[PDB]
């Protein structure tokens, strides 16, 4: 009698889910019987990922290729999934830089991608969850929310704004059967991280294996995270066993962040 998360037959809208942590979340939810609508910008990769999840599990996997940060792209995703039980917010962050070089429009784009679009997706779906007495909102943010990185001012700001908004709203809807929680990944072994690592490796003159050992040395767990274990945490939060858990900021970083809290 293994752990039954109790969400088979529910529906999840999973953002930026063709690769990486979003993909890991979709895979974990489908493995528990959750039907999916998965969103990304690029058609080809999104379709292959859907084909793989569909073949591995026994659920439907619809796809929306769109830019969810625009009004018409957001409407496209919501038309494909108008009444989700589960919403996984997720978006790429802006490139590193010095805030002296960021325009006003740079700040707006970052706030739209990593704060206002998540809030609008919650806005559009939360009343249906309330009416049905069940909802699970999981926002993929970053361990930078706990310890902001110097060169990531844009996502430091935008994701911290989402986190403060979530803290207020989570307490408002939990009594109606809807939880809202944030997952804060540290460094995870995704294709994006790998091709990023290969960028700074050829730049810093080091090998790719050498620079990987350096970033690992700063992780007490001595490894990167995997998209499977991240998806597993997402699935548990979405379960019928987690309805007393809301407004939480779960750090999945192998202990790298040094704070007591």
């Amino acid at each position: 009698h293994h752990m039954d998360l109790g969400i088979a037959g529910k529906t999840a809208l999973v953002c930026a889910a063709s690769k990486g942590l979003g993909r890991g979340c979709a895979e974990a939810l489908a493995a528990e019987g959750v039907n999916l609508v998965i969103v990304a910008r690029t058609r080809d990769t999104l379709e292959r990922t859907a084909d793989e999840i569909r073949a591995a599990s026994n659920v439907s996997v619809a796809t929306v290729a769109c830019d969810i940060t625009t009004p018409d792209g957001r409407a496209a995703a919501l038309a494909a999934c108008p009444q989700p039980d589960i919403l996984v917010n997720n978006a790429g962050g802006p490139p590193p830089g010095d805030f002296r070089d960021f325009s006003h429009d740079d700040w707006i784009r970052a706030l739209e991608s990593n704060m206002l679009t998540p809030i609008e997706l919650i806005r559009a779906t939360v009343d249906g969850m309330i009416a049905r007495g069940f909802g699970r909102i999981v926002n993929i943010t970053s361990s930078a929310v706990k310890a902001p990185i110097d060169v990531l001012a844009l996502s430091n700001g935008a994701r911290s704004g989402l986190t403060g908004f979530v803290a207020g709203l989570a307490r408002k809807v939990v009594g109606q059967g809807v939880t809202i929680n944030n997952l804060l990944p540290g460094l995870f072994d995704t294709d994006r991280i790998a091709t990023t690592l290969a960028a700074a490796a050829n730049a810093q003159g080091v090998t790719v294996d050498e620079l990987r050992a350096r970033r690992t040395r700063d992780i007490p767990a001595g490894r990167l995270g995997t998209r499977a274990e991240f998806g597993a945490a997402c699935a548990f939060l979405c379960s019928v066993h987690a309805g007393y858990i809301t407004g939480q900021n779960w750090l999945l970083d192998g202990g790298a962040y040094p704070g007591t809290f």
Copy 2:
């Protein structure tokens, strides 16, 4: 293909597990195939709880009736479970009061029960976990660690001391396959809470149903927690999917604590 926590056949030592949250943890672990050694002070209740878990699951459930806060009682528990894979620390807190009335010995007893005994149990078992490349330590503390209650100075102090100790040690052993995490319960529907509630109800002149509605009004989720959902969180932390999670303080309180973090 539901979620396989991957811990069938492992061994767990669960403290103060004849009733309440400790019992819920033991039940959840046994349901995932974990063989148990369960500890309490009173023989009769401990044996009935073991009989019930044994009958419901297919695992062995050994019992130790002892006072784990003494050297000889701690040795009794460790003799019954010398090499656990999983350790669940758990102990009743001291009664409420005014610190002007607490003796030095009151402080010592509270520190022994809720801080030093957990640390000694970790001390006695962690090297075996390291040698085997796997360990899970879960400390049941309290939501008071995040927002200390005026009349619970003794447990406010002792549990905060354990929490600070854990933060340092968790980062040291995670690379060796051992995680250490704290579960912070809010108000849960246990027999202890119920008979406590009936105490302050006959004292304050109110009904038992009236005082229950009052404490609920301060919980945004509009209900008390259950020992099953608490045990489910413990089981997930103990799983092979949670090895990148350490040093965490997971609040299970229906959103009552108002802080962003």
Copy 3:
């Protein structure tokens, strides 16, 4: 007889936002008592120039005024023309009205982010390089105790002030080695004209006496009183002092113990 604390900043210059009344005026008056020359900003001219008159009489520093809207590019340019090289910058702005985020338009979010996050960041961007060049800077952002404990009806300022706080944390570690600190002051409930006006409208809306509603909110404050703009300004002045150069990226809660978190 006794020495008493010399904050060491006499003759420096502070740019203080929304300084015509309330907490911003408290910071301006506390800095003026330390010998800091002032440029004070507000949208309306009449009240702002009256405040300048009164600070000039009460202190021995120069006070200049800019009536402008710092949430626009033109208003920010006007402020920086009048104070191009501040040693001290106090960011400060009123928050948006409360409501339910399901009734917010997209522009409600943009305006809240502009007022309470992007405008402070832009003023920091425009002033920090001069502070670095002189080896001394003090930036104090007036945010809110709501940053520690958000409530759902203040969704707009919850989000925007939290976003500012997250940015500040990153930048503060980058510039402290060059003599610039960046810290946030988080007020609970303070005895200002704005608060007294807002409280009266809630008492008339709820059908209760102003005394009844004042007492109710005081019951939720362990200190049993409201804060004063003077004690708030005093904390601002200490952060701006030569004795606070090892303090940066902090979020100092001035709320009479109202927030119950250990941290």
Copy 4:
């Protein structure tokens, strides 16, 4: 010409623990400059009385000394006999040596809890009722930046100082409405004699120059320097002032930005 900050506590009395040198001496000297009469405590007589001599010459307040061990009942009684009714209490004690908790005896934990948690709590218990009766009290506990970011080799002080911090949080909300505040100061790395002695033994053990090891630890501090006992004492004095009565249960980090957490 300029007024400069009057902390309003001239003529009050402070009991300052481990005040013969280092951060405790910094707090004593900062309070004496505000007109606060002193009772200063340390275990050894010669250094303590020398410090009293020097503070007396530098200030206009009375200084009394108690050579005692405040970790024992007798030592605490001696301290309270010499200062039965302090307005201000500064708790302060050196922490245990570093090590691996698997090598600690049970008594190692008891002694660490006594020194860094139970002794401060007992001194608060012995002095708080008088502060309440007079409507004014200031308690400042010197803890450590390790309370925010514990490292495993400091397990003993990690646990004991965290336990004190959790107790303080609860009590601080109970007494602030009666005019008593309780706050914690969390030092990072400060330029004291104790630190210089410890650093030299690590440089001789590691086979490196003292300069080499000093530079290495400074590289981990964004401020690029060590803290001073003077700026630490200044923050203590501000918390002890009449301008800090709305501040309680706080944990002020003085570490040059070393700890990277937003909060």
